Amino acid sequence: DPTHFEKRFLKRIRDLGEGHFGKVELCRYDPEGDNTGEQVAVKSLKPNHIADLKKEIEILRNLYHENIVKYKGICTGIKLIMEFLPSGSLKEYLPKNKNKINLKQQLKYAVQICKGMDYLGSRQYVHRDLAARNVLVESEHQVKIGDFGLTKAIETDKEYYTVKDDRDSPVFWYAPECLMQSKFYIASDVWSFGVTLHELLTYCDSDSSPMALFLKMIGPTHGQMTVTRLVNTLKEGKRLPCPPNCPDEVYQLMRKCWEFQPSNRTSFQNLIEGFEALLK
Numbered sequence: 001d002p003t004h005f006e007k008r009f010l011k012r013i014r015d016l017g018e019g020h021f022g023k024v025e026l027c028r029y030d031p032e033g034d035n036t037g038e039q040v041a042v043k044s045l046k047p048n049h050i051a052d053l054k055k056e057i058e059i060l061r062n063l064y065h066e067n068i069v070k071y072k073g074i075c076t077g078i079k080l081i082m083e084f085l086p087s088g089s090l091k092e093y094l095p096k097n098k099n100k101i102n103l104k105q106q107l108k109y110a111v112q113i114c115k116g117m118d119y120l121g122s123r124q125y126v127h128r129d130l131a132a133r134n135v136l137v138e139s140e141h142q143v144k145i146g147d148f149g150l151t152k153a154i155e156t157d158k159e160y161y162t163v164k165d166d167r168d169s170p171v172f173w174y175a176p177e178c179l180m181q182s183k184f185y186i187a188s189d190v191w192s193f194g195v196t197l198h199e200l201l202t203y204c205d206s207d208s209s210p211m212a213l214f215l216k217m218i219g220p221t222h223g224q225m226t227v228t229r230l231v232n233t234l235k236e237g238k239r240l241p242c243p244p245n246c247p248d249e250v251y252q253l254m255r256k257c258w259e260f261q262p263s264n265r266t267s268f269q270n271l272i273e274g275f276e277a278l279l280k
């Protein structure tokens with residue numbers, strides 16, 4: 001079985017990244033024992049979260065798209081084995097490559113994120129975690145959606161999935177329905193995409209991050225009152241400002257991701273056409 005990675009041959013090299021419950025490591029699968037084996041990215045949990053990882057593995061095993069990270073297999077306790085992309089995420093790549101990545105490349109990356117996301121939605125799934133940290137860089141010409149840790153299936157003939165465990169949520173990327181009722185629609189991922197586009201256009205600058213910008217708008221002195229204050233700001237019609245050097249035509253497309261009601265938001269296909277017209 002080419003998708004079965006034996007524990008004895010999966011050699012840990014170094015850490016790539018870490019979250020609250022999981023971590024990704026660079027390993028080499030070396031059955032020959034001479035360091036000629038293929039490098040792979042391995043996701044595992046820190047010592048039920050085990051059940052969630054098993055559902056995440058089965059989602060990725062069945063996704064096939066040029067802008068979705070490639071599933072390679074499993075190591076059985078279970079580890080998810082995937083292709084290794086040495087450039088890492090946009091969050092680490094963009095601050096180090098501003099000279100190479102111009103506006104034309106930023107908009108092509110935006111089209112690619114939209115294509116991967118439209119494919120996920122056609123498979124009846126809602127991501128719930130679309131942010132620059134979850135987009136990997138294949139090359140200066142290609143990006144891939146690189147994590148599916150919070151992904152849920154939407155029931156047939158239903159418009160949304162309700163999440164009970166909303167602990168450690170990326171609130172500054174969440175649409176009003178997610179914050180107010182814990183409801184996740186395909187239109188909620190469109191809202192998240194608008195915030196990821198803002199990150200891409202600022203080259204993931206820490207000082208102008210969505211969290212930093214919203215906290216200036218609401219006040220960084222609230223604590224447990226932060227989310228209510230965020231909801232009030234959005235209900236008032238306030239939104240993230242236009243990124244520096246971002247043309248108005250691009251900002252207007254970003255604004256279409258942030259219509260208050262999910263049913264009024266632009267689709268991923270409408271965004272692709274919008275960006276393709278600006279690229280011509």
Ligand SMILES: COc1ccc(Cl)cc1-c1nn(C)cc1NC(=O)c1cnn2cccnc12
Binds near residue numbers: 016083
């Ligand atoms: C999407 O990334 C993550 C997802 C979950 C976690 Cl827990 C950490 C990262 C992460 N943090 N950082 C800083 C870098 C990461 N990842 C890579 O560099 C990487 C390279 N190839 N690859 C393939 C699949 C997944 N990740 C990678």
